[PDB]
Amino acid sequence: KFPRVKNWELGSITYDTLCAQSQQDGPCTPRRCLGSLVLPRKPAEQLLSQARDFINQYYSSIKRSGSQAHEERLQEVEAEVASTGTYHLRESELVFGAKQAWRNAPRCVGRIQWGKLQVFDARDCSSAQEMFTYICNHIKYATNRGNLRSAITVFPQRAPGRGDFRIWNSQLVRYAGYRQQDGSVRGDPANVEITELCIQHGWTPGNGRFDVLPLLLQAPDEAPELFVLPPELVLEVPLEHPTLEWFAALGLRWYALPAVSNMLLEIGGLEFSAAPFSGWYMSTEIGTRNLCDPHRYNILEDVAVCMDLDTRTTSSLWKDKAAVEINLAVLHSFQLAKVTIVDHHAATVSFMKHLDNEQKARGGCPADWAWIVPPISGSLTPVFHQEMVNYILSPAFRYQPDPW
Amino acid sequence: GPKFPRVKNWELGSITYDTLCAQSQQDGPCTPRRCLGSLVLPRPAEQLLSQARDFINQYYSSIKRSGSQAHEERLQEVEAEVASTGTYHLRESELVFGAKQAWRNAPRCVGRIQWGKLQVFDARDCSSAQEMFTYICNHIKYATNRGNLRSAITVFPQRAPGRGDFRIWNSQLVRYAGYRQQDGSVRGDPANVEITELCIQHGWTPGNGRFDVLPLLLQAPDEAPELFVLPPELVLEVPLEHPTLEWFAALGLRWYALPAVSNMLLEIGGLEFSAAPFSGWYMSTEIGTRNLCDPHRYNILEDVAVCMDLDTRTTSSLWKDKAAVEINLAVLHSFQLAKVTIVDHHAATVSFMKHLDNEQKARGGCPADWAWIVPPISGSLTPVFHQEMVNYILSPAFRYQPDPW
Numbered sequence: 001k002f003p004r005v006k007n008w009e010l011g012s013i014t015y016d017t018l019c020a021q022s023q024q025d026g027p028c029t030p031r032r033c034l035g036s037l038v039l040p041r042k043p044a045e046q047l048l049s050q051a052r053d054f055i056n057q058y059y060s061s062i063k064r065s066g067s068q069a070h071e072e073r074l075q076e077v078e079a080e081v082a083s084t085g086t087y088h089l090r091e092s093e094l095v096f097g098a099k100q101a102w103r104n105a106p107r108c109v110g111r112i113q114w115g116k117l118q119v120f121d122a123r124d125c126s127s128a129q130e131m132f133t134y135i136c137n138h139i140k141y142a143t144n145r146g147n148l149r150s151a152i153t154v155f156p157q158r159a160p161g162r163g164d165f166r167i168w169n170s171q172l173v174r175y176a177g178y179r180q181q182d183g184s185v186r187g188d189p190a191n192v193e194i195t196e197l198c199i200q201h202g203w204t205p206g207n208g209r210f211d212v213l214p215l216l217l218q219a220p221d222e223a224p225e226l227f228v229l230p231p232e233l234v235l236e237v238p239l240e241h242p243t244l245e246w247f248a249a250l251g252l253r254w255y256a257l258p259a260v261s262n263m264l265l266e267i268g269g270l271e272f273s274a275a276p277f278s279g280w281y282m283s284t285e286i287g288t289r290n291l292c293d294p295h296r297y298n299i300l301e302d303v304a305v306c307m308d309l310d311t312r313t314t315s316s317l318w319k320d321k322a323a324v325e326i327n328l329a330v331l332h333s334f335q336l337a338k339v340t341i342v343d344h345h346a347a348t349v350s351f352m353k354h355l356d357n358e359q360k361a362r363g364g365c366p367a368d369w370a371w372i373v374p375p376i377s378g379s380l381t382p383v384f385h386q387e388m389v390n391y392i393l394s395p396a397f398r399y400q401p402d403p404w
Numbered sequence: 405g406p407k408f409p410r411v412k413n414w415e416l417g418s419i420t421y422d423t424l425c426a427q428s429q430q431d432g433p434c435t436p437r438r439c440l441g442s443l444v445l446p447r448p449a450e451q452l453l454s455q456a457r458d459f460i461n462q463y464y465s466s467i468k469r470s471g472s473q474a475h476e477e478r479l480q481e482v483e484a485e486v487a488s489t490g491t492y493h494l495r496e497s498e499l500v501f502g503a504k505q506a507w508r509n510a511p512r513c514v515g516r517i518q519w520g521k522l523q524v525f526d527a528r529d530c531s532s533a534q535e536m537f538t539y540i541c542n543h544i545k546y547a548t549n550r551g552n553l554r555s556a557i558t559v560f561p562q563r564a565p566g567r568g569d570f571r572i573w574n575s576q577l578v579r580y581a582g583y584r585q586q587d588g589s590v591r592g593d594p595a596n597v598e599i600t601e602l603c604i605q606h607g608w609t610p611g612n613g614r615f616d617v618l619p620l621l622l623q624a625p626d627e628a629p630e631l632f633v634l635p636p637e638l639v640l641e642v643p644l645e646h647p648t649l650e651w652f653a654a655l656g657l658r659w660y661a662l663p664a665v666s667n668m669l670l671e672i673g674g675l676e677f678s679a680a681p682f683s684g685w686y687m688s689t690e691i692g693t694r695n696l697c698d699p700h701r702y703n704i705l706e707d708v709a710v711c712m713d714l715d716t717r718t719t720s721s722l723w724k725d726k727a728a729v730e731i732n733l734a735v736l737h738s739f740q741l742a743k744v745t746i747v748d749h750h751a752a753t754v755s756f757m758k759h760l761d762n763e764q765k766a767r768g769g770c771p772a773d774w775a776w777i778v779p780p781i782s783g784s785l786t787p788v789f790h791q792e793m794v795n796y797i798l799s800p801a802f803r804y805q806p807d808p809w
């Protein structure tokens with residue numbers, strides 16, 4: 001029945017009863033667990049039941065279940081689906097749903113912040129040009145001169161027999177990755193494909209390691225359009241180390257704003273194929289994954305050599321030492337520039353508080369241990385020793401196929 | 405595509421499919437509705453006979469005599485034996501194969517590249533706690549080999565119907581005492597408070613150091629457990645020092661050479677070996693990160709960080725990460741200097757990737773528990789972080805079992 005959940009550092013035990021509210025299967029079966037897999041392998045009645053469940057969630061949230069307005073709204077949704085095969089959300093429902101989808105995201109360690117989310121309604125958008133304007137305003141609001149504010153902008157929902165609104169870029173701000181003839185890559189290797197799409201769609205490329213990409217924005221059944229972001233809108237933090245002077249000379253930097261733009265937002269059965277959302281960075285995303293992954297900037301060996309570490313053997317722990325200093329430079333640099341950032345210790349400590357809040361509030365919290373535990377110093381954080389239960393609740397953020 | 409889990413390595417972009425999972429005869433804790441993969445400890449002659457037949461089939465495949473007259477005769481012999489006694493018995497070569505297969509099958513072990521090289525000591529003739537002690541001492545001496553460690557397992561008699569189990573009460577053959585103090589704190593290893601108190605209840609004169617080696621509490625069938633002190637010359641330890649931080653040696657830290665787990669159950673063909681201690685050599689993060697830095701273990705992080713003169717009043721100094729790295733380095737350097745076998749988390753995980761490739765060819769997959777395989781510091785700096793894994797139960801298996809008391 002209900003899973004018993006133990007924290008092995010504290011010996012404390014909870015029971016997840018929230019998982020009973022899941023209506024979608026994940027990838028595991030009794031025969032085998034597939035929890036470490038990154039991506040999933042792959043009528044009106046279904047829509048209506050999801051819509052009803054969501055409207056119920058909404059009215060429960062404002063403490064008006066069974067009220068006159070609740071009953072009426074359910075009738076509206078019914079009548080609209082029955083006549084048109086679909087329906088539309090009111091702005092307040094949309095705001096509630098967006099917050100819930102963040103709240104429900106099992107891979108997000110940042111969910112203590114979930115109720116604080118600025119929601120821009122961009123559902124009255126009819127062109128790529130219009131999308132660009134909203135995106136620019138989103139970035140301006142969210143960046144806020146370094147005092148970062150979580151935000152989401154929601155473009156029109158998918159409709160049957162019509163192409164989707166899509167942002168082709170995986171994030172609103174990304175660095176170009178240029179493939180050199182000698183097989184190597186200049187810039188960010190994770191972005192080679194989008195970089196090439198941009199050029200093919202008319203972009204005049206740079207040739208640096210940190211060239212901010214233009215956006216490819218797509219209105220339904222139209223070819224994507226290219227828009228260069230005004231450089232003053234894109235706040236960036238040059239990286240230096242608090243004690244190691246040669247570090248600044250590495251010419252490293254990162255953008256302030258993590259804004260994911262290729263995920264699908266699902267609310268009450270309705271799907272929003274373009275709904276980019278941003279918060280602020282946890283230092284390890286930059287210092288560990290983006291800069292140290294072998295298939296990203298891969299700077300570990302460079303930094304270790306500048307530290308005069310013995311790269312001959314793994315047993316010198318040169319990689320571990322370099323990684324720590326790189327993460328330190330990220331924290332120092334962001335703090336020096338007055339740009340919001342949170343280290344992995346403070347973040348995971350906030351997440352434990354969040355688990356506790358959610359236990360009292362809903363009787364559980366879906367969480368993906370492999371993603372919640374940071375990529376360095378895992379067991380040095382409280383989340384490592386916390387058992388977690390992973391399941392899919394809706395409203396939800398989902399992966400969706402690439403539009404090309 | 406193929407009707408089997410598809411497994412991707414995100415560093416290299418390479419793809420495999422796990423077909424081995426189809427062989428799993430036992431359910432784990434997950435369902436389509438919720439994944440419970442992070443949970444540490446998740447919850448009949450014909451049942452015996454089917455497990456027995458499956459194992460005998462595995463054995464004869466492994467020697468390429470599947471379908472042979474000897475295969476069919478051994479099957480007949482196991483059925484006869486279960487029919488007239490309710491149980492059966494493994495031949496020596498079957499026991500050796502089963503023990504190795506149990507190790508090969510262990511999803512949480514990063515050290516499985518070595519699975520073929522395991523010295524199996526058959527102790528199924530043991531009939532007293534005294535004799536268990538002799539077997540255990542011999543195991544330790546062989547496995548320790550003055551620092552050139554050798555993987556080994558010693559197998560004591562199986563569970564028998566209407567007869568008490570052989571049990572080793574201790575969780576490992578070598579463990580440090582944990583003494584609860586009057587102020588509520590613990591001196592030594594807090595993990596070992598209960599066993600320490602049990603040893604005292606059974607007549608042990610306790611010490612009062614941070615690193616007192618515990619005596620062994622050994623139990624022969626239907627007998628009270630008896631106490632046995634390990635002769636200190638048999639327990640190899642390594643004092644911890646740091647290659648450049650000269651003060652680290654003054655901390656007086658140390659650890660033992662031999663990780664020898666003694667409270668797990670070896671299951672083979674439905675037979676249950678309740679006492680079957682097994683040993684290898686350490687991966688350095690087990691000592692340097694978990695045993696020494698866990699808040700509920702020795703918890704030395706702040707002490708080290710203070711000696712290093714770090715700012716422990718704020719998380720953003722990364723004092724915890726810095727201290728933890730130097731502690732791990734001290735473990736590695738000290739074991740290396742002492743010429744005692746040890747492997748760092750980088751070399752270990754790299755060897756595990758080799759093991760995955762070996763097993764992909766040999767068996768079409770490898771059961772692996774991602775959360776346990778990925779080391780507790782520097783996770784994404786190791787290749788296994790970026791490797792998707794499929795987790796399932798295969799038998800022969802090592803299993804958790806309830807404590808005898």
Ligand code: HEM
Nearest residue numbers: 102105107108109110113150151277278279280281282397
């Ligand atoms: C406010 C500060 C925030 C912090 C510190 C934070 C932290 C993180 C981190 C560290 C990850 C793992 C990322 C990775 O390894 O690639 C993550 C994932 C995620 N975050 Fe948050 N986040 C924040 C805000 C938000 C907001 C505002 C939303 C949505 C409204 C959100 C939704 C998500 C989702 C859906 C994922 C999983 C993405 C995936 O499955 O690939 N986060 N977050």
Ligand code: HEM
Nearest residue numbers: 507510512513514515518555556682683684685686687802
């Ligand atoms: C030869 C060197 C070996 C290395 C470097 C090694 C490494 C490891 C590590 C790091 C763990 C995780 C332990 C923890 O976090 O508590 C582990 C677990 C495990 N090892 Fe290995 N190991 C070795 C040999 C062996 C041998 C010889 C056996 C059995 C014959 C074995 C069976 C197991 C089992 C069953 C577990 C998981 C136990 C559980 O589920 O709690 N290992 N090993």
Ligand SMILES: CNCc1cc(C#N)cc(OCc2ccc3c(C)cc(N)nc3c2)c1
Nearest residue numbers: 038258260262263277278279280281282399
């Ligand atoms: C699984 N492949 C990688 C990946 C794919 C997709 C997709 N499609 C989305 C991904 O989101 C990572 C993410 C998303 C939002 C974040 C926010 C708001 C803040 C923050 N600090 N970090 C964040 C990280 C990651």
Ligand SMILES: CNCc1cc(C#N)cc(OCc2ccc3c(C)cc(N)nc3c2)c1
Nearest residue numbers: 663665667668682683684685686687804805
């Ligand atoms: C105590 N933490 C949970 C725990 C419980 C039980 C039980 N019941 C067993 C456990 O085995 C960890 C283990 C086992 C064998 C190892 C070998 C041979 C070598 C090595 N380097 N490390 C090893 C670690 C761990």
Ligand SMILES: C[C@H](O)[C@H](O)[C@H]1CNc2nc(N)[nH]c(=O)c2N1
Nearest residue numbers: 036037038370371789790791792
């Ligand atoms: C194979 C594994 O699931 C994959 O590398 C995951 C592991 N954990 C992660 N955790 C976070 N936060 N982000 C990631 O991209 C990943 N990648």
Ligand SMILES: C[C@H](O)[C@H](O)[C@H]1CNc2nc(N)[nH]c(=O)c2N1
Nearest residue numbers: 384385386387442443444775776
């Ligand atoms: C909650 C979580 O499952 C638990 O802390 C696990 C995580 N991964 C681990 N991995 C290893 N190797 N050993 C452990 O004890 C643990 N503990």
Ligand SMILES: [Zn+2]
Nearest residue numbers: 028033434439
């Ligand atoms: Zn699972």
